[PDB]
Amino acid sequence: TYMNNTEAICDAKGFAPFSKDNGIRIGSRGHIFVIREPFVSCSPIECRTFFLTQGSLLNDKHSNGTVKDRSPFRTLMSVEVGQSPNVYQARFEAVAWSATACHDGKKWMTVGVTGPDSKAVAVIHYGGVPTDVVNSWAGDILRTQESSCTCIQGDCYWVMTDGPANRQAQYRIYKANQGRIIGQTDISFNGGHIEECSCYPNDGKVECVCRDGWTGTNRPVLVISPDLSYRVGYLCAGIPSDTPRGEDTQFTGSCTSPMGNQGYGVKGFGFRQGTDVWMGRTISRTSRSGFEILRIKNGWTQTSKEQIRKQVVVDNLNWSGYSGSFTLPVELSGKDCLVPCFWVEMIRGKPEEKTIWTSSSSIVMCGVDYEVADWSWHDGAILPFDI
Amino acid sequence: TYMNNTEAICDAKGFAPFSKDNGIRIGSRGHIFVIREPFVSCSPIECRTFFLTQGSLLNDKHSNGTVKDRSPFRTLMSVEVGQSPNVYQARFEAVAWSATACHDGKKWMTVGVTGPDSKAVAVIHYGGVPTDVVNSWAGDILRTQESSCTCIQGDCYWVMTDGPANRQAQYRIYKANQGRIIGQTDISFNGGHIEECSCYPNDGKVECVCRDGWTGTNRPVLVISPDLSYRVGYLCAGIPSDTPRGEDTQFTGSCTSPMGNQGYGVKGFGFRQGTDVWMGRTISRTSRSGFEILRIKNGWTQTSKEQIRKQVVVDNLNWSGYSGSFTLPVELSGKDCLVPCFWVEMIRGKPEEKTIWTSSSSIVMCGVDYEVADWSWHDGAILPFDI
Amino acid sequence: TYMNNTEAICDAKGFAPFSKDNGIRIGSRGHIFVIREPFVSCSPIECRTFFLTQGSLLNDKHSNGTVKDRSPFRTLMSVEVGQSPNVYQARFEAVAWSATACHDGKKWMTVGVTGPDSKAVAVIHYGGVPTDVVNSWAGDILRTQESSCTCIQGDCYWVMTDGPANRQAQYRIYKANQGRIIGQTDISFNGGHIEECSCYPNDGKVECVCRDGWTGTNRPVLVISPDLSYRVGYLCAGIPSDTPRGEDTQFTGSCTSPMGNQGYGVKGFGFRQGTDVWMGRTISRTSRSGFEILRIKNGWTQTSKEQIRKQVVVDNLNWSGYSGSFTLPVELSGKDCLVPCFWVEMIRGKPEEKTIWTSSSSIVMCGVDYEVADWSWHDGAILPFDI
Amino acid sequence: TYMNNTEAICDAKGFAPFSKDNGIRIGSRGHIFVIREPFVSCSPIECRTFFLTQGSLLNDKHSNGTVKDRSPFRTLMSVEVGQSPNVYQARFEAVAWSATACHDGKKWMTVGVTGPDSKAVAVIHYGGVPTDVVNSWAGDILRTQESSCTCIQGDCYWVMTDGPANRQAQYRIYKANQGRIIGQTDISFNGGHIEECSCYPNDGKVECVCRDGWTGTNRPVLVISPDLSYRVGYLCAGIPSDTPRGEDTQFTGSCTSPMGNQGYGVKGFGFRQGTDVWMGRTISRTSRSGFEILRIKNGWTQTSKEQIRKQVVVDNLNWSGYSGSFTLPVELSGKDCLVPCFWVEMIRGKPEEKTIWTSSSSIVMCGVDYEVADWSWHDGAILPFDI
């Protein structure tokens, strides 16, 4: 029976730790896939941690240039949330250097993008077997979320990008049912840039917080209705949640356009709470270190900078990285609303550290009705490795 | 359907071995999590061994200061009772440096405590997803049992401590149903000290034998009714079952107050048998070595020192450590009463041995109608390791 | 309930990647069985990757003469498609240095051939237990497909060869139901040579594309009806799809006889598409390197050389090897026709490279309605190994 | 529902290979438990390989004196038949240096014997939890089968020995239902010696072929009826099937008394076939090397030495060892009779080879209606190891 994700996202006051895999630390002696871009998605029975392997393991010579983002050895795999991305407990999902996945109440759907940069192919899987495909439509690194996709009443949706990673690119919403594509839409966002959207279900619609690697330090936002009509813009909040970025005091929000000159960026997330917003970000404003989430009153609908809550999950003396959102299935939380949860990726190795490799572990946090105390659940690995 | 643990604890004459994981010995070459504080808990289908990892493996550099008790890398995981705490067979439970867990007949509930010492957070899980939380209420290492919690007719109970580990601290009983907290009580025990309670179901109530790390060498006791009313005191028996402690001859029992001057201590257990009591303890009275369990006639209700039975499980030439209780589900034992079972933790490494690490394995014993012969099922590992 | 594989094979325009195990690369540090001859077969619930181990692991001395094709240590095992052939996730199937396997809708059937070269024995398994046997009938390396067998409405069929690997040999079709042999037929093919047939279901009959290691560079073909009547010949197409072979321009097809002088060969596959054919082959015409599949119009019924589609899966700068076919169960693809899928084996080590061992990994591709772009999903391992 | 093992044992003409684990060869680099005494037993759904670990792994220092037969680190574990006794796929069964196990149609029952030599304890398990116990009754190494026990219509039976391993000892039959002992009988066999019985179901009764380590070179036999009445004697056959032993020509059989002077011995098996018998034995008559099984006409009821069939499974240039019997459940073989199957243990290391350790792998064979060709599926490991 299809999973009903039609409920509203629960209003949360704080965040509690769900899991921590300790992938790298274990990888010093255990058999762990060198990885990157991990994310969480849950079925009505369990939550899994998806990740992009590099076809090699930690502390092995094949972990050499594992910073190259894309290769034909890159594969999407999964384990139960909390377990390291070890070989022996892993489930194979798809061949990919970019991916997304989600359960529709009956089975798992995954989308792995691989192939050559100018004509990549996204293979859609459902039930452990390819079922449909999307070919590059702009011919320039067809890619996707790097976080959980969203399924509402049997239908699943996700966003893909194809084109430059700086100047204007192209963006689409895809809709599928049982692994078969049944709809797509072109997102008009002239001047705006969308990458690695972090999405979740809310009041029957798909809400995402993405990344603008062109000119904005504030994150793009889009609300997707099942029919495929949408709303694109930026997190109104007058606090920039991307990295790199500038000071908050010198920032001016906008729900319509990108602000700041900073070009690059990093995947991030955000949850709407009525008119408010829970927004995650690295503590360092120039680097991928530390991690905190702030709740801004009216932050979702106005250029507000009023902070009602702040919780640290990784201090600034430790490397962070990607971070995305997902929700707990009602069939597991017992609650009457979708529990918002996010994960934070913690990168170790190049380009910041003295190693031939690059990989990451993660920490997962979830909704909760109380305010939780600050702390640092960092990676903890001691670099460099025996190599 | 909920597990009925309303029956009385079976009267046992001796104890038979259930399992032995050989974690450390295997860990010399296999991929085993460095651990500490292991315990057993059973569902209607199987018994599992829960443990606190240190986010690292044996014979790896990350096992360095693994004696520090608390860190943000510490996680609660589980395996089927008897298997070593190896990476590839482990299930992730919670992020924690202190924990408890138990099955209610439908699912597993676990409680992991992590965070900073002054404002720690206990995340409650049910079904593999966080469901509720308890924040530090005394702001000084919020902690729990380190042994199986207790579920009776759908409701599960457990004890937590928050405050100093020497002088007076504070103690509470928590009650939950389906992962949602629905009750709590403050335990008044002025002059007494409660830590790491070992609990089990008996005649419809929760009975625990705990640890007084303040001034007592005899163990605190509390009988918890489902409504949350309780009874707190000490094991009446005139034989001190804590470590360190003094001679038995020079000991005077008390069901009301702590006796002896010895400050420190070690987690231990005890089972009521009508008016009698099966009490476990290290053979050495000053160190954590050896292990034996004694049955004292009328030992539960009087300052009795009459020994009717004595069985050794670990001789005094071998290191022991923690030990807790749990019961076999009627749906597995086929019996008509709850079969009492305990486990003994065997510590290797610091602070007693020449290693950079600290970890432990275990041996599990269970009820049984006959007297079992003495022996030593010790750890067996050859220290030091390649390091 | 029996799996209905009575439908026609879907008409495909291109092929999308299903999986890539990265077995060798992982094997540099992980615990991977040295293997050879891998293949895919699917049940109504999942697809598995079967393989022939050599009773040893990569980067271990026992991988020494692992090029010898046959030994008493060789065993057939399986894992879910996409996982490396690692120890801890493997299911034991049969003792064998030659094999075939397939699911009939209720259980898995496997056929492992082992024993001495002059009187080998094929043990048939069904449900994880031997059920029947076939003894060598020609007394000269009794062998089979090295690819998925075919089950139609409860009955499974496969082809075996017994006799010389150069000059004329003998060939048979075997039929079984629930692991019990219930039929066999002798294939008269005087002048022709059949080895390692790659088969699949089509319009209610078993269609195979095999290997002629005697004198032909074009592949033998046989259409098997459930009653055991058959049709034997060669892929009509005027393009030689075996290796080694000569130029295409200098080739003349034939649906009746072997063409070319080239003796040796390599396992390959082919799918009928109405009158057309999708045929796989190594790019190099002299060596086992690179891999591409071509669609020849009318290629199945005429000596046609008209290429309508060409897709590369492994470039010529990388080693390839065996390749076979299998189909997706309707109960997984949701489609109304059998989705054609193939796999390509990529050999590393002897006799082409500087290693004491020989093994291989694989890449799996599947049907799909669109044309997919060229690329190379090669092995990726860095030889030689620590040895 | 209880497994019906009331049928007669199928008449077999030859034996086909079921599995081969390659435990030692894999153990050169993989994580394999050093073991000894392996055996096979099947449930209505699968066959498993039980084994006695030594609490340590191959190629690790803890494998040092692993020849000592008994220690408190010895544990009984299992895996699916065919898989090596690796850490990550193993199920914990019991603490033991001697064991037996079998499925009754509903669950697994195992019996592990551990403790001190003078007062050992046999813990009986059913469903993964201890359920009953047997204490040493002679106080001298209480021990059991080292092979599969036998369950007929819900009841399981097995044989235990307690006393000297040379001169007269004591022997009993145990009967249990759902893990609870409900019967036992003393076997009067004055002058005879019974050890490690290999048993199987036949025409509703339990038939075993055991080992006389006192004075006989021929094997003891006992037919056990469910009511516990029995028949004890020796394999009538005039061919000695124990090791060491003397020439066959100089042997005189007896169904009543032990023959030959040879003292020691080795576990072996035998299947009745009407009046005939399939008997296994090492090829060497003085050492534990090679393995063959012979069918002797009328061999079960007369001092017959008429050989109708002979099949080799391990040549004399390779080490063998223990060997026991088990039967395939009708619910798996689809047949109408119990399929007889045996396993052969192959010892490597001390006392015959230059290693600090001792362990073994195995090969499993099964019934079958045809005669199978001779061959050698030996261990294949290259000793010594890195140590």
Ligand SMILES: CCC(CC)[C@H](NC(C)=O)[C@@H]1[C@H](O)[C@@H](C(=O)O)C[C@H]1NC(=N)N
């Ligand atoms: C070129 C476009 C980039 C996205 C903004 C790039 N995406 C892909 C598919 O390569 C990401 C980016 O280079 C890396 C990062 O910013 O950390 C990860 C990297 N993502 C992945 N390797 N999956």
Ligand SMILES: CCC(CC)[C@H](NC(C)=O)[C@@H]1[C@H](O)[C@@H](C(=O)O)C[C@H]1NC(=N)N
């Ligand atoms: C500071 C309070 C102590 C309890 C009496 C302390 N508990 C915690 C949560 O740190 C324990 C104690 O220091 C150690 C021991 O006595 O062996 C284990 C240690 N327990 C854990 N690391 N889980």
Ligand SMILES: CCC(CC)[C@H](NC(C)=O)[C@@H]1[C@H](O)[C@@H](C(=O)O)C[C@H]1NC(=N)N
């Ligand atoms: C001698 C006949 C050959 C088939 C044409 C030979 N088959 C067997 C059972 O040994 C194959 C051949 O030598 C190897 C190859 O061509 O790659 C694989 C090899 N196949 C296997 N080892 N399973």
Ligand SMILES: CCC(CC)[C@H](NC(C)=O)[C@@H]1[C@H](O)[C@@H](C(=O)O)C[C@H]1NC(=N)N
């Ligand atoms: C002392 C009695 C012996 C049986 C005849 C002895 N049994 C036990 C429980 O120790 C066996 C014997 O010494 C060894 C062998 O013959 O190979 C195995 C050994 N068996 C086991 N270690 N389980």
